[PDB]
């Protein structure tokens, strides 16, 4: 709930840490144009945890929402904001023709129409230099061989659905097995020992027996896998003890 | 809780009638077939059924 987001070329990233993931406050908003998670399901975020989650904010001309996706090409996809092929997150985009649009013309957004080379994923290029397209060395002024690469938008409410300003929010979280802080309001129980019971520390469900071995885990390591990539040892988030996950009878 | 259905509200709060048609496609005696037409019942010959 912000009045004005950042520009396309100057998209702002918000770091989130030590949070209780409760995404139920987002479903009660207006029906979003495109709510598609590329690595998870939208109804499963409240039952999982996140290591590092970042939120990006940028407003586009609406019809360019298809460009914010892995493997897509275009102006914004190659010059302003690119998503990697191994992207794991969710894309949230809704209509903002009533907020980020003016009847006389809103000129507070740029999209970097011209650029020398393609932009790499998850980068920001806010250089306001004059794009030299010709051979003569451009002296930073507008000329027949070099123009202004930063072009303004024509956001007006008179345009139909498709040219209106659409606020896009990209949630880039990391679900890799690692010491995390954001897990949600999931409640805690008692720590039993030497019995076949379930375990759910940071979303890892299963059935095993805790043995409390003498494994020396490093501060940045919490999960450990065997040859078959099966997590057989975990570090308790609350207590600094080491507990192994051994299969039952 | 009651709804606040009013024609002044735009898309997102207007009343929308939803009809869910649950069917049963397992092999069983059916009586809700589509209209169509019945033909002749031939026998002892390779034909469609």
């Amino acid at each position, epitope marked *: 709930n*912000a*009045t004005t987001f950042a520009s396309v070329y100057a998209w702002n990233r918000k770091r989130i840490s030590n949070c209780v993931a409760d995404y139920s406050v987002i479903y009660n908003f207006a029906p979003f144009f495109a709510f598609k998670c590329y690595g998870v399901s939208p109804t499963k975020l409240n039952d999982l945890c996140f290591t590092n989650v970042y939120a990006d904010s940028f407003v586009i001309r609406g019809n360019e929402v298809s460009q914010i996706a892995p493997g897509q090409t275009g102006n914004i996809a190659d010059y302003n904001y690119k998503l990697p092929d191994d992207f794991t997150g969710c894309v949230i985009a809704w209509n903002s023709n*009533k907020l980020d649009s003016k009847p006389s013309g809103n000129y507070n957004y740029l999209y970097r129409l011209l650029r020398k080379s393609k932009l790499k994923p998850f980068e920001r290029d806010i250089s306001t230099e004059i794009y030299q397209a010709g051979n003569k060395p451009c002296n930073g002024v507008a000329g027949p061989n070099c123009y202004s690469p930063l072009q303004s938008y024509g956001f007006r*409410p008179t345009y139909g659905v498709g040219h209106q300003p659409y606020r896009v929010v990209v949630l880039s979280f990391e679900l890799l097995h690692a010491p995390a802080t954001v897990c949600g309001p999931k409640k805690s129980t008692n720590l039993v020992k030497n019995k076949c019971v379930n375990f759910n520390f940071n979303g890892l469900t299963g059935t095993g027996v805790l043995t409390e071995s003498n494994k020396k885990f490093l501060p940045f390591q919490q999960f450990g896998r065997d040859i078959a990539d099966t997590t057989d040892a975990v570090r308790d988030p609350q207590t600094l003890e080491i507990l192994d996950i051994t299969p039952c009878s | 809780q009651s709804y606040g259905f009013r024609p002044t509200y735009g898309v997102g*709060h207007q009343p929308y009638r939803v009809v869910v048609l649950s069917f049963e496609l397992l092999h069983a005696p059916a009586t809700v077939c589509g209209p169509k037409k019945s033909t002749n019942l031939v026998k002892n010959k390779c034909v469609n059924f």
Partner: antibody
Amino acid sequence: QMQLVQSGAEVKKPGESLKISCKGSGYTFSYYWIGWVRQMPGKGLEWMGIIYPGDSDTRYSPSFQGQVTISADKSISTAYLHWSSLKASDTAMYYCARQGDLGDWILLGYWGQGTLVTVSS
Amino acid sequence: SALTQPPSASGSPGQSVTISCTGASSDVGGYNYVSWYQQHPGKAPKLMIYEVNKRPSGVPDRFSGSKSGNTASLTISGLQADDEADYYCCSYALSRVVFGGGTMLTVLG
């Protein structure tokens, strides 16, 4: 010329509904956010809520969610402010504001004249 | 959040005064979501200073604005007799406008 005209002074008693109006002219009354600001005698400004002339997109203040409702008529380009079950503390000055050609969507650069409501039972 | 403003200000004509405004929120859009309004006794308020790095049209250069951290400042170069009015600051960062307490401008005692 853009201008905002409001209704005259209304003197009522608590326990009775009240619906003041504020008509805007000289501009397209379909894209400019219309809101209301409460000003108690001797106090500061208090925001209650805003409306959109195109479609019903009402965002009320957290302290004025169900205490007051705001509506408008796009056919005649006139905004309204309806009350229900007035109390003795509702006596204050009310203005109608709209966004300008520049700034944010809740900048409220333009204002009206002012409608003084007093019950004081 | 709620904004805080001094109860009143004093300044002789010709000198400069500064109005404080502490409590402005922020978001991922920016930190310049501070606006000022002037309301004379007996009329509707008027937008004088918003987006303190700029200023609207028809407003003299006497009214200037600034912001340092979570505290906003309203700088008036020249003080005149028609400047005695209530000045309020507004924070519109989190899609919610909040008006401060208010400060009345006058001359020395």
